[PDB]
């Protein structure tokens, strides 16, 4: 759907690991989802697994980090998300998806477009969109700002 | 060795979190047992002043309020009374035994007992006073507890205000307990379960008539919540579905999967060197899905939750078992587009090519499903009667025992519909495929033979499902509506074939403990539903009969949903709450709440005449009127009739600030009355009386318009006022402008405030009613259905 | 104003606009947000007055 | 001496809108013959929202 | 879809502001019109062509 009437916003998201949107809301959202899912089952083994996974997300919400510097060792408060996990990749894809879905409800205050495609792969993401009319420089600039 | 630290400020997200439960963990209720006797007034010694104002060597007991805490402004007073109504309803008890709270009178002739510690305290105080009459001591000596144990009844003395008597007597005469016998234990159980010889019931107890029990409120949906509150309905539907999954039995010994599937393998004559569509028939013929389908189907059909299909058209056996499914189960029970697509596929690759027809030219939004048009396109007696049945397959909505029921045909229950279908299939097997090759015949006919060699087992399976379905239908309290849901369950037809292919001569029936659990949970939910409805209806009908105009009817509904610990209050909007409110307005109130509110209505003003912090208004007539004699004050600036002068409401002035009238009346000294809740101060002087200060307070109101820095004066005069020699010597009747609109306290009548509260003696109350019942099932082979004929018999 | 997420909930679950295109095509809700309602309220009023 | 673009005075209060919502509820209650079924229930419920 | 139970009306200060502003604009409009007209007519009466 690339055309003279369409545009595409593409964006690198590789620095968004220490960010303020990978802390508390992400984990608590997942915890809430687990609560819903817990109320969506009857078996007990599963609920045990879910409560343990929940508590895992609790522990990942507050997490300190061994780092040497010469001989002595620093340990820093890092209650957020990064790679190095069975969950991190797909979960980061999710989180970037949720983030961009959250961002994307603001161009709608000033433009009419039909979201044709959104894509997220790790350290980047891009969405293409087509308009009711043809594109100009001023609309791209103002949209960008 | 050393460790180093780098601390870090952060934000903190704060959800609402909408605390949930599931049905099995919902606790039923906790009864209100009574605390102290719900007093509103209490006595108090005050001095007393004889007429001419001077003082006795004696005191007197007067009624006063407990907790004078009332606000300024009538709106806030109506708020107070809303809170008061809420408190009494929060304190309204269900049952009460008086002996637990009773105590001993220290002054009874016969050494008898009384009801409360404070009653006897008052008695003792009045006993130890030097200046109290002998008659109240005589009264205290005659007052005792009476008993008639043939009837299990007691009558205890109490001393309390007449309104208090009204409340407590209402509690006595409307305490919801009934005599309990085993006949009521029986008749609380449904008829269908008593009429079922596959469950046997007994108990090892004989309760007495001294026992008691609370009857649940299993009243129906006043609100029609199936009508356009579809989010909650989908939630509820899932919330019953999950409950239903908890109670379907796990299957007993099934036939060996590998052996049955070895037989399938032998009967198919596969080849290791071809693609063979037949191969896909084996997709998902495991155990653990047979059980899954068995649970999912039944829990859906009981919960009235729609369900959707996922199926790959390359697997024809999936379709071939979905045939049976869609035949024996109605079509509106599934979501429309799924089974439309599935039936359409089935037609366009098994059926119309056998009799030599076009595939189809079927529309997406066809107002007819393909089977309806196909009822008339075909030429086949069996299939045509079959399609007629299909078109007229639907539930029967019938109200039995108060609850609605989606009852089957009574030709579906007993599996006979399958004979029409299977006869049609026999007359299809015998067909040639004039258009299509012989390998395709071979594949199709072989697949349908795998299901045609299980005729009896499928009939028995359907009958078994039907039995458990009706048996669980009988254990419902909430009426079961037929309206399509938002959300489905993805059903795999591989699990259906797994179900249909692994069964023989073993029956699963719900254990009675599971039944009783399901029933008690449904009971508790329904009773919670009705009681919270009744609560909320009470508050709404209260608030609309009181002009609580600033109040915003959102938090009430939020509390209503919070007490139902399964809903998402943080993500329900306001419009839905308000529509729920709009329906709630039109409902009748229950008898308890309606009566209590009527009492409170008729007596709130009388209650308001008390509370000696605020007076109900003030007149100003620029004239030196006379003062009235009283005997707890002396001469006071008090009014009690309000005749003459025209009255301005002050809450009306706060609402509609128009100070033109009052201002005009003040410059030109025009007389007026002023109505509205108001403080005062108690000026015990004299020099602030003659100077006529209580008119000085209002001239700021024209300067600064805010009527909040408004504090009237109260001109109290007595023998404890530092200047009472004046009234003795100078011989002047006091006179004052600006009387106050107020009533005096009511003198305390010891005789008439005494009452005798009557109640039962020593009953017991039981809640978990089916704990006394022991229950068991017949042997599963020795079962029997409605038709008086063994299900699960074909071998 | 009303919290957006409630309306998001009910629209999102009852519509299933996720489902109501091709499943392999892109569809979802659109801005219910704040700073658009009052934007509209200003736009409308100022245009009708002018 | 100033011009004004005024309303019908049954609009300044909302009373004429009752007739609108009766019509809209009726439109909800009707089928959409050509239309699909998933898309119809979705549309009907989206109308019933307002 | 997000509104209910919160009334916002113009402050009296806002009303007064918007009235003074509109008054000033209209008054400026009429005064400069009259001035412009006068200067034009005076330029056309002294035969300054």
Coordinates of N, CA, C and O in Angstrom, one line a residue, chain D residues 19-36:
Chain D
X19 N -37.8 11.4 20.1 CA -38.3 10.8 18.8 C -37.2 10.2 18.0 O -37.4 9.1 17.4
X20 N -36.0 10.8 18.0 CA -34.8 10.2 17.4 C -34.4 8.9 17.9 O -34.2 7.9 17.2
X21 N -34.4 8.8 19.3 CA -34.0 7.5 19.8 C -35.0 6.4 19.7 O -34.6 5.2 19.6
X22 N -36.3 6.7 19.6 CA -37.3 5.7 19.3 C -37.0 5.1 17.9 O -37.0 3.9 17.7
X23 N -36.8 6.0 16.9 CA -36.4 5.6 15.6 C -35.1 4.8 15.6 O -35.1 3.7 14.9
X24 N -34.1 5.2 16.3 CA -32.8 4.5 16.3 C -32.9 3.1 16.9 O -32.3 2.2 16.4
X25 N -33.6 3.0 18.0 CA -33.9 1.7 18.6 C -34.6 0.8 17.6 O -34.3 -0.4 17.6
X26 N -35.6 1.3 16.9 CA -36.3 0.5 15.9 C -35.3 0.0 14.8 O -35.3 -1.1 14.4
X27 N -34.4 0.9 14.3 CA -33.4 0.6 13.3 C -32.5 -0.5 13.8 O -32.1 -1.4 13.1
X28 N -32.2 -0.5 15.1 CA -31.4 -1.5 15.7 C -32.1 -2.8 15.7 O -31.5 -3.9 15.3
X29 N -33.4 -2.8 16.0 CA -34.2 -4.0 16.0 C -34.4 -4.7 14.7 O -34.8 -5.9 14.7
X30 N -34.1 -4.1 13.6 CA -34.3 -4.6 12.2 C -33.1 -5.3 11.7 O -32.0 -5.0 12.1
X31 N -33.3 -6.3 10.9 CA -32.3 -7.0 10.2 C -31.6 -6.1 9.2 O -32.0 -4.9 8.9
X32 N -30.6 -6.6 8.6 CA -29.8 -6.0 7.5 C -29.6 -7.1 6.4 O -28.7 -7.9 6.5
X33 N -30.6 -7.3 5.5 CA -30.8 -8.5 4.7 C -29.5 -8.9 3.9 O -29.0 -10.0 3.9
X34 N -29.0 -7.9 3.1 CA -27.8 -8.2 2.3 C -26.6 -8.4 3.2 O -25.7 -9.1 2.8
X35 N -26.6 -7.8 4.4 CA -25.4 -7.7 5.2 C -25.0 -9.1 5.7 O -25.8 -10.0 5.9
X36 N -23.7 -9.2 6.1 CA -23.3 -10.4 6.8 C -23.8 -10.4 8.2 O -24.6 -9.5 8.6

